[PDB]
Design a protein around this motif. Structure first.
Motif, mmCIF file in Angstrom:
data_model
loop_
_atom_site.group_PDB
_atom_site.id
_atom_site.type_symbol
_atom_site.label_atom_id
_atom_site.label_comp_id
_atom_site.label_asym_id
_atom_site.label_seq_id
_atom_site.Cartn_x
_atom_site.Cartn_y
_atom_site.Cartn_z
ATOM 1 N N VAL A 232 0.754 -1.216 0.000
ATOM 2 C CA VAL A 232 0.000 0.000 0.000
ATOM 3 C C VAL A 232 0.804 1.297 0.000
ATOM 4 O O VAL A 232 1.802 1.451 0.704
ATOM 5 C CB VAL A 232 -0.901 -0.045 1.225
ATOM 6 C CG1 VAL A 232 -1.959 1.032 1.191
ATOM 7 C CG2 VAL A 232 -1.475 -1.470 1.312
ATOM 8 N N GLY A 233 0.281 2.232 -0.764
ATOM 9 C CA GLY A 233 0.844 3.553 -0.914
ATOM 10 C C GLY A 233 0.242 4.490 0.097
ATOM 11 O O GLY A 233 0.412 4.313 1.309
ATOM 12 N N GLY A 234 -0.478 5.473 -0.423
ATOM 13 C CA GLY A 234 -1.116 6.537 0.338
ATOM 14 C C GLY A 234 -1.860 6.149 1.615
ATOM 15 O O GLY A 234 -1.704 6.815 2.629
ATOM 16 N N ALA A 235 -2.704 5.118 1.573
ATOM 17 C CA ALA A 235 -3.452 4.760 2.760
ATOM 18 C C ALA A 235 -2.563 4.338 3.929
ATOM 19 O O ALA A 235 -2.974 4.377 5.082
ATOM 20 C CB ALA A 235 -4.425 3.642 2.417
ATOM 21 N N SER A 236 -1.339 3.914 3.629
ATOM 22 C CA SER A 236 -0.433 3.451 4.669
ATOM 23 C C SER A 236 0.047 4.512 5.643
ATOM 24 O O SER A 236 0.587 4.187 6.695
ATOM 25 C CB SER A 236 0.670 2.529 4.226
ATOM 26 O OG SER A 236 1.579 3.279 3.457
#
Lengths: 249, 250
Positions: A232-236
């Motif tokens: 995961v990118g942004g949500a992480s």
């Protein structure tokens, strides 16, 4: 079947000491009832604070990139240094590196081999672009990407490899990937492994979805037979990452 | 002008172990440094924490060996904002290794420098010509071109945060040897360039470091040169001999 799933957080080039400490407090207070490997890949600078503050036993820390050997390479970090520092996981060949930093299939393949050889657990990223997708080139491209890596490992090496499928074609292009498309790509990858390396290897291999994942679509995504988790990118970088971890039950 | 405050910068490059660096920092903390000298240690990103925590000598500052201008979707890299947040105020930009192996062109280096200065960092900007450029009598054009790129992005006042490091790339691993005279010559041209295009006030205060092959035996002779204000050290910086190098700037 379903081998142990992985929920990997790719913080990319972000974070403040304040912001990250808070998230880490969140993570340490989170109850995780299932068997899952959680991974936090922070920037090099933050590896120290992460290693010191993250106490949750279901988490491991990892680096977002490295070079194979120490030496006269100003600005870079090598595997040996990471190892010396207590880092056992690493993300390699991320689409951003392939696109902006000159990493070709072969360089990616060399980094992976070096990593595995050094005892790391590696998250090797693969994925095709918009152009390759639209011209019906997904299978050719992804399989070529994987073959490169494979060319350098021994059957036993597979135990340390994790494949991350990135739908580059759906990242920043205005296109949306569907859970079915994700599953299709993962199955194609696993089939290859089964046929070229072995069914035993293929049955144990974790293949993560590295597209756009959030609290809302994660469960739908994990449900697919060939999806073993997420990169995961942004949500992480948000509390919502916990929801994502929970979606892997 | 009399000489400005010299700088002795250690560029550890892609090296170090927690153990090895600890010993080295212990050494440094136990060293007496009598004169006015800015000592700089540029470790890998991973080791910034440990350096920052153990290096107590008031004459030393820590620095990063590279960075990108902004934070965002750039897996593997570190940005200026993050370093700043981490309390790092010095950085080395445009090193020959980055220019050769990682696609950094004059303009990319220039953008990084400018972003760095705008963020409040002290920057050690690296310039230098290769063997080919040297042999074709192109030293002046090349180095002058590299500096102009940087210069185009700064304002007069910004110069207070810039430090130039001259790397004789043509003498690095080529089998050629640089002499103190060649070093002085390259440094003098840079200074005259700054004097003419930026100003004499700027030029007299500007530190120009020598970043070729420096050790404990040749440091003093190099420091003697009128236009040499210190060093950007490679291999010798991972050794106790680095102390000798600092002392030679007296």
């Amino acid at each position: 079947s379903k081998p142990q799933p992985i929920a990997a957080a790719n913080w990319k080039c972000n974070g403040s000491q304040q912001s990250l400490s808070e998230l880490i407090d969140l993570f340490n207070s989170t109850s995780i009832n299932h068997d899952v490997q959680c991974v936090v890949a922070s920037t090099f600078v933050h590896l120290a604070m992460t290693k010191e503050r993250l106490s949750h036993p279901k988490f491991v820390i990892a680096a977002q990139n490295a070079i194979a050997k120490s030496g006269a390479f100003t600005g870079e970090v090598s595997l040996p240094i990471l190892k010396d520092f207590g880092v056992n996981w690493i993300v390699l060949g991320h689409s951003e590196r392939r696109a902006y930093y000159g990493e070709t299939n072969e360089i990616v393949a060399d980094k992976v081999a070096a990593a595995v050889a050094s005892g790391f657990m590696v998250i090797a990223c693969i994925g095709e672009t918009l152009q390759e997708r639209e011209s019906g080139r997904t299978a050719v491209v992804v399989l070529t990407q994987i073959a490169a890596i494979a060319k350098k490992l021994k059957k036993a090496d597979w135990a340390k490899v994790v494949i991350a499928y990135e739908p580059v074609w759906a990242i920043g292009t205005g296109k949306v990937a569907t859970p079915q498309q994700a599953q299709e790509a993962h199955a194609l990858i696993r089939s290859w492994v089964s046929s070229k390396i072995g069914a035993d290897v293929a049955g144990e291999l974790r293949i993560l979805y590295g597209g756009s994942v959030n609290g809302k679509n994660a469960r739908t995504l994990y449900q697919q037979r060939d999806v073993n988790g997420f990169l995961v990118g942004g949500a992480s970088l948000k509390p919502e990452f916990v929801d994502i971890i929970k979606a892997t039950q």
